[PDB]
Design a protein around this nucleic acid. Structure first.
Lengths: 314, 498
DNA sequence: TTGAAAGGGAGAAGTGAAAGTGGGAAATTCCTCTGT
DNA sequence: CAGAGGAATTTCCCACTTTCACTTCTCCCTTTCA
């Protein structure tokens, strides 16, 4: 009862990738796949199911809001042009790989013109209908031909959407939208399947999206009594949105949590936190119990890898 | 008469401001200013009190005191400098509205041109010395007063320079300040680990400086111990007297080596009895010195030359020791899991890459030079290198060019349309085998640095093999005839075909 | 009870230049507290 | 209601790593010589 469709095999990793301004030069590594690791790298992948011989897949940067829109940042590298990646695939293989994909960080002052130009290409071209742009004449598809006379009135609509969207635009997060195409009777790739959107990709350079990490600390132990001062070194955090949490998984789906004591003034230049230790689950205990410590961002509950902390009796 | 500065401007602490900040951005405080009491730059004009003028401009901190690109802004400031009328009844003059506006690097040339365009050039530095990088983090005020000689004509007196004024916002010229210390006490033996929270420092130009009653010590930490420029984790140095019977209160302060700048001290009393960065050149010298890599050794007492084992990795007897230094580099840089203290024997697939990463890194470094490529003599395959500057004493198209030249005997043309050429090809095992017989072969080896008539034993089969190997699988060229076997006149014939 | 070297073919290794990588930090711009 | 100073946004560039575009080697036989 189905038909040919596009499936995202490997999703792009969500955190840790650095977006790049054009002044930083081309290529600084391509967006990693969620499975990629240390010395064994991987990349985002799509698979055209219920095959269709040759096919050409494209990728676009869409926003992350409720309303999937066109982002102002661009994709660059390998097979890209105007922030759109276009790759061929399908002779025999139906799994496309996407290495060498970089995210060009557009400038702030720059976002309005880029968005207007990027959307204008869409109204005129026959890629994705009046979805990513605005609820209107969503025709001008890949049905008849590829190109449309931008009416005088239509231009006002793009400008208005561009102005509204620039304000909504979040330059720290972005999403990938894959669109596949199957050959025409003429051999042309016009047969458009359904678009698929990927997980949100956060800019590792954004303080709020920064991947948290405990770089080094004073001591890794203290008395269950708590109240001892600690000196912790970490990656960039925001003084008003950071907390140090201690915890130990308890018997039978249980978990005790404790919070380091400190004020935002104790956060030094975004890179260090001097705090006092919380009191352990129960004062008077038998022998040294070990727990875990972790930085945690309030606003989104994101966390750093845990680091062992040893509690000992008084 | 003459100008004298009575109140110098505070040197550190105030940041320069960009036009973009504009707004109300304070003014240059005076040497003795405190949080509670601000003072201002002030001059005294010895030997004169009356009408006159004063221009204060900005100039380079160092000797060729050229007009600095930044500019003064505030009351009575125009075109980059300050100029006002003197007070006829006061011989001491105060300037309380001097602000320094820094120009962007992108706009530096226009700024310098404006300076010449307005004659703001106190020491009339000729347009020549007036060029070359400028230190945009430091400036000196230049006072240019003009009184009047005994009734009548004006009179400019020698210009005076102030102490330099450094940009407090710029990272390598900012004011040093310790903010919080882990522990302010420790053993007289030293070695206690301390966490110090500070203001922006540069991990490659900063130290923890201890002092006191005629004594000086320095905490030890590698640049890797400086965290994101605002935190240093080091170890206490040993105290002068390694035998305390009582605690001693010493001084602890941040120190910027390059210019001696110091921060306010933090008390510290002694009491009674982080992986460093692997830079390739420093790392390589250490490994050669270690004596732990058979084959990797110094070739002299000065330690300016050294050999690196370099056996071709296609060899089937290739041992661990043969590739030990190449693997050591991979492991130090985290591209290969270390030992015990899994692993996969797919370790020999990795070795070619380990060698190239080592060769390429060595080359990028620009710190070494190759003296001899002994990766030949089968017995001991290795390369010899010398450190930069100390005894640097280094010691299809090609064929197309060669075809026209046909210099040496044996080669020439048979096809007067360029494509069908004849190359000699006698079998080396012939008693009549000549040296210049493989002349065309010899040309390729020499023309690639492969062979040098003076410093290189001749290898005839290799010259023949390499000349041949280059041609072989080269799509766009192939063989014709083959009188190679011909007992009388050995020779082949090739041709092209794009 | 195929001897000593030279010759070939494949294809992995080796090469210097020139991009590509991953990060940290410097330059610039904004903007919030301090304390109206 | 500045205006000192903490951050956020952008720009540079260090110090190698990988790839590009070819060229050479070791392997493993074959041929050729005397």
């Amino acid at each position: 009862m189905d038909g040919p469709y596009l499936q995202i095999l490997e999703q792009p990793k969500q955190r840790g990738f650095r977006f790049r301004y054009v002044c930083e030069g081309p290529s600084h590594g391509g967006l990693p796949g969620a499975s990629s690791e240390k010395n064994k790298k991987s990349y985002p992948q799509v698979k055209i199911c219920n095959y269709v011989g040759p096919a050409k897949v494209i990728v676009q940067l869409v926003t992350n809001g409720k309303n999937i829109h066109l982002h102002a940042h661009s994709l660059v590298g390998k097979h890209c042009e105007d922030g759109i990646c276009t790759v061929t695939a399908g002779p025999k293989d139906m799994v496309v790989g996407f290495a060498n994909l970089g995210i060009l960080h557009v400038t702030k002052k720059k976002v309005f013109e880029t968005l207007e130009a990027r959307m204008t290409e869409a109204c005129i071209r026959g890629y994705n209908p009046g979805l990513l742009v605005h609820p209107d004449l969503a025709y001008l598809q890949a049905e008849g031909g590829g190109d449309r006379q931008l009416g005088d009135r239509e231009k006002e609509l793009i400008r208005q959407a561009a102005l509204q969207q620039t304000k909504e635009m979040d330059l720290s997060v972005v999403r990938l939208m894959f669109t596949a195409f199957l050959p025409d009777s003429t051999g042309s790739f016009t047969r458009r399947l359904e678009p698929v959107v990927s997980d949100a990709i956060y800019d590792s350079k954004a303080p709020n999206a920064s991947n948290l990490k405990i770089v080094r600390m004073d001591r890794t132990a203290g008395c269950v009594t708590g109240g001892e001062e600690i000196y912790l070194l970490c990656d960039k955090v925001q003084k008003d949105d950071i907390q140090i949490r201690f915890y130990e998984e308890e018997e039978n789906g249980g978990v005790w949590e404790g919070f380091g004591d400190f004020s935002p003034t104790d956060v030094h230049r975004q890179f260090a936190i001097v705090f006092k230790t919380p009191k352990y689950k129960d004062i008077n205990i038998t022998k040294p119990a070990s727990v875990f410590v972790q930085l945690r961002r309030k606003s989104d509950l994101e966390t750093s890898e845990p680091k062992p902390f040893l509690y000992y009796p008084e | 008469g003459y100008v004298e500065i009575i109140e110098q401007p505070k040197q550190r602490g105030m940041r320069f401001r960009y036009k973009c900040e504009g707004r109300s951005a304070g003014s240059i405080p005076g040497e003795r200013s405190t949080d509670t009491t601000k003072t201002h730059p002030t001059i005294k004009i010895n030997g004169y009190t009356g009408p006159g003028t004063v221009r204060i401009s900005l100039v380079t901190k160092d000797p060729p005191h050229r007009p600095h690109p930044h500019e003064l802004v505030g009351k009575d400031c125009r075109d980059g400098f300050y100029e006002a009328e003197l007070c006829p009844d006061r011989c001491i003059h105060s300037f309380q509205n001097l602000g320094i506006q820094c120009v962007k690097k992108r706009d530096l040339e226009q700024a310098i041109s404006q300076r010449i365009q307005t004659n703001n050039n106190p020491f009339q530095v000729p347009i020549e010395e007036q060029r070359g990088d400028y230190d945009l983090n430091a400036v000196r005020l230049c006072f240019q007063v003009t009184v009047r000689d005994p009734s009548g004509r004006p009179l400019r007196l020698p210009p005076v320079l102030s102490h330099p004024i450094f940009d407090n916002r710029a990272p390598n010229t900012a004011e040093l300040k310790i903010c919080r210390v882990n522990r302010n006490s420790g053993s007289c033996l030293g070695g206690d680990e301390i966490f110090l929270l500070c203001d922006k420092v540069q991990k490659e130009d900063i130290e923890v400086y201890f002092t006191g009653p005629g004594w000086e010590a320095r905490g030890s930490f590698s640049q890797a111990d400086v965290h994101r420029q605002v935190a240093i984790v080091f170890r206490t140095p040993p105290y002068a007297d390694p035998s305390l019977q009582a605690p001693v209160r010493v001084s602890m302060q941040l120190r910027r080596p390059s210019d001696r700048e110091l921060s306010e001290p933090m008390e510290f009393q002694y009491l009674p009895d982080a992986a460093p960065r692997v830079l390739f050149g420093e790392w390589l010298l250490g490994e050669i010195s270690s004596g732990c890599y058979e084959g990797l050794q110094w070739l002299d007492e000065a330690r300016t030359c050294f050999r690196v084992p370099w056996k071709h990795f296609a060899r089937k007897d290739l041992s661990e020791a043969d590739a030990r230094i190449f693997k050591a580099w991979a492991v130090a840089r985290g591209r290969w899991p270390p030992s015990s203290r899994p692993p996969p024997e797919a370790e020999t697939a990795e070795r070619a890459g380990w060698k190239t990463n080592f060769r390429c890194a060595l080359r990028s470094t620009r710190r070494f030079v190759m003296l001899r490529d002994n990766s030949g003599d089968p017995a001991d395959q290795h390369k010899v290198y010398a450190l930069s500057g100390s005894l640097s004493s280094d010691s299809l198209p090609w064929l197309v060019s060669q075809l026209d030249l046909g210099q040496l005997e044996g080669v020439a043309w048979v096809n007067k349309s360029r494509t069908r050429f004849r190359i000699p090809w006698k079998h080396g095992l012939r008693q009549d085998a000549q040296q210049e017989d493989f002349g065309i072969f010899q040309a390729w080896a020499e023309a690639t640095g492969a062979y040098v008539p003076g410093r290189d034993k001749p290898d005839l089969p290799t010259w023949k093999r390499n000349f041949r190997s280059a041609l072989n699988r080269k799509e766009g060229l192939r063989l014709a005839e083959d009188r190679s076997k011909d007992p009388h006149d050995p020779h082949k014939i090739y041709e092209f075909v794009n």
